[PDB]
Design an enzyme around this catalytic site. Structure first.
Site, short mmCIF file in Angstrom:
data_model
loop_
_atom_site.label_atom_id
_atom_site.label_comp_id
_atom_site.label_asym_id
_atom_site.label_seq_id
_atom_site.Cartn_x
_atom_site.Cartn_y
_atom_site.Cartn_z
CG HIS A 51 -0.54 0.50 2.44
ND1 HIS A 51 -0.23 -0.32 3.51
CD2 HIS A 51 -0.35 1.76 2.88
CE1 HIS A 51 0.15 0.41 4.53
NE2 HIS A 51 0.08 1.70 4.17
CG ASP A 62 -0.21 -3.62 3.16
OD1 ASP A 62 0.40 -3.22 2.14
OD2 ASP A 62 -0.57 -2.88 4.09
CB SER A 101 2.17 2.05 6.71
N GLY A 102 4.72 -0.07 6.64
CA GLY A 102 5.84 -0.66 5.89
C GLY A 102 7.04 -0.95 6.78
C1 LIG Z 1 -9.74 2.11 8.49
C2 LIG Z 1 -8.25 1.93 8.33
C3 LIG Z 1 -7.64 2.76 7.23
C4 LIG Z 1 -7.51 2.21 5.95
N1 LIG Z 1 -7.94 0.87 5.70
C5 LIG Z 1 -7.00 -0.25 5.80
C6 LIG Z 1 -7.74 -1.39 5.12
C7 LIG Z 1 -9.20 -1.06 5.35
O1 LIG Z 1 -9.99 -1.48 4.25
C8 LIG Z 1 -9.22 0.46 5.49
O2 LIG Z 1 -10.20 1.18 5.43
C9 LIG Z 1 -6.95 2.95 4.92
C10 LIG Z 1 -6.52 4.24 5.15
C11 LIG Z 1 -6.64 4.81 6.40
C12 LIG Z 1 -7.20 4.09 7.45
S1 LIG Z 1 -7.28 4.93 9.01
O3 LIG Z 1 -7.31 6.33 8.76
O4 LIG Z 1 -8.31 4.35 9.83
N2 LIG Z 1 -5.89 4.64 9.78
C13 LIG Z 1 -4.60 5.06 9.21
C14 LIG Z 1 -3.61 5.49 10.30
N3 LIG Z 1 -3.22 4.39 11.17
C15 LIG Z 1 -2.16 3.62 10.92
O5 LIG Z 1 -1.39 3.82 9.97
C16 LIG Z 1 -1.88 2.51 11.87
C17 LIG Z 1 -2.34 2.25 13.16
C18 LIG Z 1 -1.78 1.10 13.71
C19 LIG Z 1 -0.95 0.44 12.80
CL1 LIG Z 1 -0.13 -1.05 13.03
S2 LIG Z 1 -0.77 1.30 11.32
C20 LIG Z 1 -4.04 3.92 8.37
O6 LIG Z 1 -4.25 2.76 8.62
O7 LIG Z 1 -3.31 4.37 7.35
C21 LIG Z 1 -2.74 3.36 6.46
C22 LIG Z 1 -2.44 3.99 5.13
C23 LIG Z 1 -1.19 4.79 5.18
N4 LIG Z 1 0.03 4.31 5.38
C24 LIG Z 1 0.88 5.40 5.35
C25 LIG Z 1 0.18 6.54 5.14
N5 LIG Z 1 -1.16 6.16 5.03
C26 LIG Z 1 -2.27 7.08 4.79
#
Ligand SMILES: CCc1c(N2CC[C@H](O)C2=O)cccc1S(=O)(=O)N[C@@H](CNC(=O)c1ccc(Cl)s1)C(=O)OCCc1nccn1C
Ligand SMILES: [Ca+2]
Lengths: 234, 50
Positions: free
Chosen positions: A42, A88, A185-186
């Site tokens: 991702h 992922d 992430s990563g």
């Molecule tokens: C509902 C979860 C989600 C999804 N996903 C995932 C599959 C599902 O279908 C869905 O909807 C997608 C986007 C955002 C979010 S979110 O806003 O609820 N949470 C964020 C922030 N938290 C964390 O990064 C963590 C917390 C603990 C650990 Cl361990 S990682 C996140 O997951 O960003 C990941 C993306 C990313 N990586 C780098 C930069 N960015 C923007």
């Protein structure tokens, strides 16, 4: 990282930082060897071009051990699902090899059967990165680490509003205000066994950060060890 | 056996025909005792550079 501690000199030397066109860290990675970085698939959609920085602990200073590496080839899992963050996982081959030194060393790849029976039945693993220090906060200028309890599959599936696949596991605290966050992430999830650190996860996603009854979600590296091994010979 | 303190292995423990077998990650060599894992280089994987 929300809560936890700064990585002190030589503590998180497998930490890699994916840097965008404008030299902003957006994702972490794990150093597997002089040529190969482990990251989240991702993360590949977060930038059009990116490089890998190693041996970086302060993104507002030049500590002198930092080096930037061009990515020769991106190896993304063909079954990566943007809708669920399933499969992922990505492997990056660098154009130039990393030279191991202070704050620059690889995490060990475990064997699957031992990892699952011995490592992922330990109490805790350690996650690290330059991600946000608060859910709606800014990214850290200091590399941070956090000890995260392993969570049983059942409690984790109960906790999630989104799908938890067999390519995912869960780590962190129920109520306590410590977790990985956006930008982590990563990056590495490692498990210490007799003072050696084995890669056990990739920081993947979470429902914000450090929320009550919510856990960090990690790519189950153990399920991709043959895939990683195959990627690292091409 | 591998349940009993990892069969005394530093790293990988595998039960093969009723007996413990220890092995080590790349950049490590199994010692004479067939259990301890010895680094081959100055930067073996999984070691803090303290
Ligand atoms: C509902 C979860 C989600 C999804 N996903 C995932 C599959 C599902 O279908 C869905 O909807 C997608 C986007 C955002 C979010 S979110 O806003 O609820 N949470 C964020 C922030 N938290 C964390 O990064 C963590 C917390 C603990 C650990 Cl361990 S990682 C996140 O997951 O960003 C990941 C993306 C990313 N990586 C780098 C930069 N960015 C923007
Ligand atoms: Ca720096």
């Amino acid at each position: 990282i929300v809560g936890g501690q700064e990585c002190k000199d030589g503590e998180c030397p497998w930490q890699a930082l994916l840097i965008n066109e404008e030299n902003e860290g957006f994702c972490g990675g794990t150093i597997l060897s002089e040529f190969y970085i482990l990251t989240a698939a991702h993360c590949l959609y977060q930038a059009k071009r990116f490089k890998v920085r190693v041996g970086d602990r302060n993104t507002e200073q030049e500590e002198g051990g930092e080096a930037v590496h061009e990515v020769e080839v991106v190896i993304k899992h063909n079954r990566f699902t943007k809708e669920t963050y399933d499969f992922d996982i990505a492997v990056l081959r660098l154009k130039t090899p990393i030279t191991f030194r202070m704050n620059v060393a690889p995490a060990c790849l475990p064997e699957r059967d031992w990892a699952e029976s011995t490592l992922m039945t330990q109490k805790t693993g350690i996650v690290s990165g330059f991600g946000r220090t608060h859910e709606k906060g800014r990214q850290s200028t200091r590399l941070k680490m956090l000890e995260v309890p392993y969570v049983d599959r059942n409690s984790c599936k109960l906790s999630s509003s989104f799908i938890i696949t067999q390519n995912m596991f869960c780590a962190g605290y129920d109520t306590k205000q410590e977790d990985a966050c956006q930008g982590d992430s990563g990056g590495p999830h490692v498990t210490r066994f007799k003072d050696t650190y084995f890669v056990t996860g990739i920081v993947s996603w979470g429902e914000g950060c450090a929320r009550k009854g919510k856990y960090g979600i990690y790519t189950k590296v153990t399920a991709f060890l043959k895939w990683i091994d195959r990627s690292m010979k091409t | 056996l591998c349940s009993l303190d990892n069969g005394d292995c530093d790293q990988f423990c595998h039960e093969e025909q009723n007996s413990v077998v220890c092995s080590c990650a790349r950049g490590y060599t199994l010692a004479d005792n067939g259990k301890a894992c010895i680094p081959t280089g100055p930067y073996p994987c999984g070691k803090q550079t303290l």
